[PDB]
Structure formats: C-alpha cells, structure tokens
Design a protein around this ligand. Structure first.
Ligand SMILES: COc1cccc(C(=O)c2sc(Nc3ccc(S(N)(=O)=O)cc3)nc2N)c1
Length: 277
C-alpha cells in the first residue's frame, strides 16, 4: 500500500502475505494481508460484519491495482510461537482450557452464521496479553496438512462445520502433549497417520466412508490405539471431549456449541499468559 508503512513481514498464507504495518495518517498499527470474484468479495463482506471477541476484526478491504488488501486489527503473537516458547514447561492446563473454550466460542459464532474457517492451525490463532485468543486468516470457499479433517483428505466436495472441530481437536492435543498429533508430510501420510492412531475407518464407525471419492479398499487396516496413550497428561474429561472432536463421521463429531457444554469446562477460568514480545 501507499497509506501504509510496512514495519515487517510477519507471515504468509496460501493466497497472500501478511505484514505488520502502520497507518501513516492515523498511526494505528495493523496487520495487512496482501493478495495478488463476486463470490469472494461478498464472502469477504460477510466476514467484515462478523464481530466476536474471539474473531480477529477485519477493519478494511481495499481492492486496487491487481492487488487485494485486507486490513486486520493487530495481535502480538500467534499460538505456534507461544507453544514453542512454552515447550520446556508446557502451557498450564488452565490456560489450555481457556484457549480451547474461547476458540469454541468463536467457532460456535461463525458456524451459527454459516461461516467456516477451513484451515485452523496454530499459526492463525492469535493471542494478546489479556488472555484472549482469536481466530484469524479465514479460508475462503509448504502447506501444512497436520490439522486437515479426514473427510477433506478422502475427497469430500462439501465441507461442513465439522472440519473446524477436527482441526481444533488436533490443536488441543498439541497444546497438551507439546507434539503435533498427526504430523503428515503428504496427503496419504496424513491420512495414514490418522488411521494408525484412530483405526482405519469402516462402514460401522463411518457410514458411507467406503464410497468416498478417494477411499481405496486397499488402504491398510490398522486397529485403533488406546486413547490413553494419545494424550497421556490429559484427564478423562479432556480425553472424552477430544475423542468427540475427533470422531471420524462428520455427523457424529461434536459441535462447537455442544462442546462448550462439556464437563471439561466446568472449572474454566481466564488466566493471563506470560508473553515475551
Ligand atoms: C496470510 O495472512 C495471515 C496469516 C495469519 C494471521 C493473519 C492475521 O490476521 C494477523 S497476524 C498478526 N500478528 C502477529 C502474528 C504472528 C506473530 S509471531 N509469529 O508470534 O511473532 C506476531 C504478530 N495479527 C493479525 N491480525 C494473516
């Protein structure tokens, strides 16, 4: 832009690059995403009116000279950085619980407004010094596949809100164990890592799975591993909730609204994180 002074590049998605920038006139500090369709533009408008404390605010949309700029409120750190910074000691359970609860509130909100995120990952979950966490970089209707729902990997053409619950479940597990749950480095490796842990799905647990676009009868048949080995440091309420967020059948997978009512959140609080900026 010309009305902006780039302070530094802070990220890059599969459609654009994001910079920390300052409004040369107002002096406000923002996150500016630069991207190099009636559906999109209107899909974006909807995003602008999507206001919730757990959703990064989209301030302005500027279309000029073969470039599309999205101006967002700036947050100081993403969850990936915070997790790395917390790798030696781990994020305290109360904070993990607070973050999960808040993200579920944000998803409950977008989902009730028929908005799907589609690409949740630690890098697009942003945190501030007051203990909040917000959903950022919504996806429109080397890329990381670690948080991709199985139905996407199996070729489903129509995503449902369940894909976001799956991604969030993977992130929840990662915050707890301090290791990515399914770190695949290809679509098939991602799929098979999921199968090796949760068991190769079949018609019993996932009606219709064998008729999905990319399903092959030749997939290996792995037995489901004991769930207590998956996220050991997690108590039973947490494990129960996670298992519901990771159901194979999108229709059995717990909703964000239902997840918010899970016993795991009975004692939820809002701790302040120790952030090094
Ligand atoms: C492809 O476009 C994207 C991708 C992901 C997020 C956003 C986005 O809206 C952002 S990023 C941000 N600040 C920030 C991010 C990471 C870090 S770090 N690495 O912890 O030092 C520090 C500050 N604020 C907003 N609002 C845009």
């Amino acid at each position: 832009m010309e009305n902006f002074q780039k302070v530094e590049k802070i990220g890059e998605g599969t459609y654009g690059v994001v910079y920390k920038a300052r409004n040369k006139l107002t002096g406000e500090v923002v996150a500016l995403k630069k991207i190099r369709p009636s559906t999109a533009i209107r899909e974006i408008s909807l995003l602008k009116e999507l206001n919730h404390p757990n959703i990064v605010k989209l301030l302005d949309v500027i279309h000029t000279e073969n470039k599309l700029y999205l101006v967002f409120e700036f947050l100081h750190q993403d969850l990936k950085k915070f997790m790395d910074a917390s790798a030696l000691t781990g994020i305290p359970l109360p904070l993990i619980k607070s973050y999960l609860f808040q993200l579920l509130q944000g998803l409950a909100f977008c989902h009730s407004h028929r908005v799907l995120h589609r690409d949740l990952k630690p890098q697009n979950l942003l945190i501030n010094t007051e203990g909040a966490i917000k959903l950022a970089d919504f996806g429109l209707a080397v890329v990381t596949l670690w948080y991709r729902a199985p139905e996407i990997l199996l070729g489903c053409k129509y995503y449902s809100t369940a894909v976001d619950i799956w991604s969030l479940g993977c992130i929840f597990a990662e915050m707890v164990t301090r290791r990515a749950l399914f770190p695949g480095d290809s679509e098939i490796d991602q799929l098979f890592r999921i199968f090796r842990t949760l068991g190769t799905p079949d018609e019993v647990v996932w009606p219709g799975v064998t008729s999905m676009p990319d399903y092959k009868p030749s997939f290996p048949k792995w037995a489901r591993q004991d769930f207590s080995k998956v996220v050991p440091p997690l108590d039973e309420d947490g494990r129960s909730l996670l298992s519901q967020m990771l159901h194979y059948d999108p229709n059995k997978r717990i909703s964000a609204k239902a997840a918010l009512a899970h016993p795991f959140f009975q004692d939820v609080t809002k701790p302040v994180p120790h952030l090094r900026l």
